[PDB]
Design a protein around this nucleic acid. Sequence first.
RNA 1: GGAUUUUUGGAGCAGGGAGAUGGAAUAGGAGCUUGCUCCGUCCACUCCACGCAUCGACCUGGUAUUGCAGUACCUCCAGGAACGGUGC
Lengths: 162, 83, 90, 71, 74, 79, 166, 82, 62
Amino acid sequence: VKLTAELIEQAAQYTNAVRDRELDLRGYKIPVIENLGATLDQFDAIDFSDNEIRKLDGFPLLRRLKTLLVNNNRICRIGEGLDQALPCLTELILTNNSLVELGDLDPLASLKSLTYLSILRNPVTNKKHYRLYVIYKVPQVRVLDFQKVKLKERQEAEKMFK
Amino acid sequence: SIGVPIKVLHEAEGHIVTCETNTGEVYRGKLIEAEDNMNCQMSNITVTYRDGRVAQLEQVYIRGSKIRFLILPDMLKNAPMLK
Amino acid sequence: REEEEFNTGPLSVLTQSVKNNTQVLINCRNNKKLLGRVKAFDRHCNMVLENVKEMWTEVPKKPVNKDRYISKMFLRGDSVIVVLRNPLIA
Amino acid sequence: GKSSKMLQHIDYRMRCILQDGRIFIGTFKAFDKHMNLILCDCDEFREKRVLGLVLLRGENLVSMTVEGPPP
Amino acid sequence: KAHPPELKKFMDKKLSLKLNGGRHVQGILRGFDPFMNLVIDECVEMATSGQQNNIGMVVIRGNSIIMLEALERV
Amino acid sequence: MVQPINLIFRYLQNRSRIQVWLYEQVNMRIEGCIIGFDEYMNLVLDDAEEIHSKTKSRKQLGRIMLKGDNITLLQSVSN
Amino acid sequence: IRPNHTIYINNMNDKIKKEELKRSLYALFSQFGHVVDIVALKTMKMRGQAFVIFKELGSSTNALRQLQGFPFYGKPMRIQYAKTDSDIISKMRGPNYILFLNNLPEETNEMMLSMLFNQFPGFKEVRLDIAFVEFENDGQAGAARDALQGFKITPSHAMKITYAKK
Amino acid sequence: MKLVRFLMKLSHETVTIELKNGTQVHGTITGVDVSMNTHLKAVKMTLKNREPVQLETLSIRGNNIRYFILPDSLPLDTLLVD
Amino acid sequence: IPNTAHFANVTQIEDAVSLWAKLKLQKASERWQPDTEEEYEDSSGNVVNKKTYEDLKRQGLL
RNA sequence: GGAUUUUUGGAGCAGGGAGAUGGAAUAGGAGCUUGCUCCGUCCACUCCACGCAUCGACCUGGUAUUGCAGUACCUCCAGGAACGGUGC
């Protein structure tokens, strides 16, 4: 059950709780996120929860994409061309993923408009100084794992590994 | 002689709505009187403008000449507004 | 009633532009003056003209003036501010 | 003659541009002789502003175009 | 057509009217009109510095009327 | 209930000096004696004067036919 | 308190904005299921509290069980079931196959048993301190037997659900 | 006499319309009403100090249109006969 | 709704659906439904509890 | 069916002054390149008149509320002022 144009044209699309145009693509078990050109950047949020996506890549240019729900998936790697395809990506929910190393968070630093990031329920969050490395690598993010970044955490991230 | 947005504005009288004027003034409150010419008379209204001067007044009256838009709740967008 | 008021009032000044095929100038609200021959008019001053020349002045945003030419155009009576008839076709 | 210019875009998401430079993207449900647009669950872009059901008057309308498929 | 505005409840009440160009007046209404023209007897206009100037009975047209707020409980 | 047309007729019968403010123009106003009126609020002022509040000057013009689309507010003065 | 589609979380940080807290609650509730509505106020009566109403009651129950006492913006929010039904949900609404139930309350009618069995999909029939519930599907009956083993309904007694024998 | 009947008979023609805000929209005129509601298909709009954008459909009101631009090969003499 | 002699000379939709509801209620009532209409007395106490339906008896005998 | 609330528009235009202040990589003219001098287009800082006052959104610290609802907005104190509009 791969993501095609007929699956995106038959999927439900409505208004979310934040008054944004969201398309519900849950319950599809798509192994790879592709063929997203049929939406023509008419959705403000993408609900791709409960899927089997392994890599968050292969997305076309969508300037209206501001929220991406990748919860309950097996995402273990992030694409390096995420900034060239989503310049206005501000919300990224990557809870309960397959990220084990902090080096997968290195392509996530290119998103300058990203402010809300969720990396909870992951083996990469259980490593030593994971939050300090995420604050040092991504200074544009203001809320990490439902927690506001303070000045002391930014000073601790800028002190170590400088 | 009566329009369907005019009928939707007349049917939404008594609910917590807002009217944004052409100068930016947002009169919010319960729509007590709504005529066919977009005349909105509200009681216990609140002024939240584009200037930001938020205040509370006992009664307000905004005409349809300088009225830019109207923000109404979505309780009347299902029926009988489905055509 | 309407024809006598159009041929005896200010609209006759428009009616002398289409009958004798004379050139008149129209100054709009966008600081532009278009000189041309009036081909079609109406009661709401809807002027459809041919072979018009529009001149104005622009700033870089010193400034400078500019002009252009159009083969056939149509302008509504709302944006028409000033209409001047002068013997410029001869 | 047919007057089907406004009926073909009924129950569809359209983005109308205002005179001051604002853009309201909403689902057009009904209209009138004064071009009164009723945009249910509309978004205001110029930044995103949560508005919802916005009834904009026809005097502040400039242009309107199709935004996407109907929900 | 040509329905008059609902100004029967605001009769003989002290209200504040806003006019175009940022003008503010306060006075008691003495009548109504179908062209939204209001007669304010013993009206006081607010200046730019903040001082109130009494202009007496004035007539405000509907072409420049922005918002009228009733200062008294009706 | 006092009608605005009846108030304008009483002001024209009393021949008192009235000041008319323009629409979207607070710097310059007019002042004069209204002689007659019409359905379009067209005022005919005799020996009218344009008063500029910014420059504090007064320029007389005489018989002026002011349209009702520009007059926003009209007040009665004692002068 | 009976389980419902709306889960109310309280004891949260009231210093954050309303829209940011609503977006954070929506991003937290999207991992457990589709969030239909989010009611969040900042007044003096509803300070520091919000609620999320979902489409399915099982996703709301899983979000209330998993995020019970989770730290939200520095303060551990407490999640619980709603007292009344939501307005949006009310507007949108209007092993073996046989399972043996023991220690059931006699004051409960058939409508309460149907609402308790409605977490599982459509069953064949219901029989009425002992009760017998038979489902049309074997996996649905197994999920209903695994879910109702120690359920929180009428807390003066404990309800026990077991598979029927031959 | 009436310019609305002349504007309504100008369908299937590539024209341009300049608004009061400086935005020029060039496209094929497909629908004209009595209130000068110009409904065009596959238009290109250029605003003041902005980039031109191509749209599949556009609907401009009559009160917002300041000027129009017709091609030189338009039969204005034949279309004027009512 | 099936085509039978009951739905003759009936031309409107809502009338048809209402008469179908009526006929459904009537027929479903007048049948013999053993599942809900039956009196079993299970051997749990064997001298009491004759209010057992046809489903609770299987649940008790399972 | 161009005379006050919708469609023949009341819209257009310009951002205070000064200083031997600083820059036009590839884009000004003249004294007929380059170097220099003069004059009608910005941004950054400084000074006078942080252009002024207002309220809304917002950041730091301290502090209060533990409350079951369908919402312009919601505790208070102090500092800073990146944003919006109102009148001069």
